[PDB]
C-alpha cells in the first residue's frame, strides 16, 4: 500500500511480525489498517 | 442513543465512562457516537 498513514496514526509490528496500528488521538490500537478498514 | 454494533460502555475505578470495542478489541475514552471524551 503506497498511501501514507493518516494524521495521528503510527504502524508497528508485533514480535511475531503482525502489523498493527496506533491511534494517538483516541489512544487505541488495532490490527485494522486505517487506510483500508481491513486487517 | 445506542452505541455502534460491537461497542460497550464500561466504567473505570473512579467512575469515568469509557468505551470498549469488541470488533477491534480496544478501548477509548472517546465516545464513538460523538468523537469527544
Amino acid at each position: 500500500n503506497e498511501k501514507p498513514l493518516p494524521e495521528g496514526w503510527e504502524m508497528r509490528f508485533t514480535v511475531d511480525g503482525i502489523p498493527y496500528f496506533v491511534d494517538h488521538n483516541r489512544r487505541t490500537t488495532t490490527y485494522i489498517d486505517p487506510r483500508t478498514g481491513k486487517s | 442513543k445506542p452505541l455502534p454494533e460491537g461497542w460497550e460502555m464500561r466504567f473505570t475505578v473512579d467512575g469515568i465512562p469509557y468505551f470498549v470495542d469488541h470488533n477491534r478489541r480496544t478501548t477509548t475514552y472517546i465516545d464513538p457516537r460523538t468523537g469527544k471524551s
Binding site: 508497528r12 498493527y20 496506533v22 487505541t28 490500537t29 488495532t30 490490527y31 | 477491534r24 478489541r25 480496544t26
Partner: peptide, 10 residues
Amino acid sequence: EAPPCYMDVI
C-alpha cells in the same frame, strides 16, 4: 488475540 495495549506501546 487482542492488539497490544496502548500504554505498553508508548
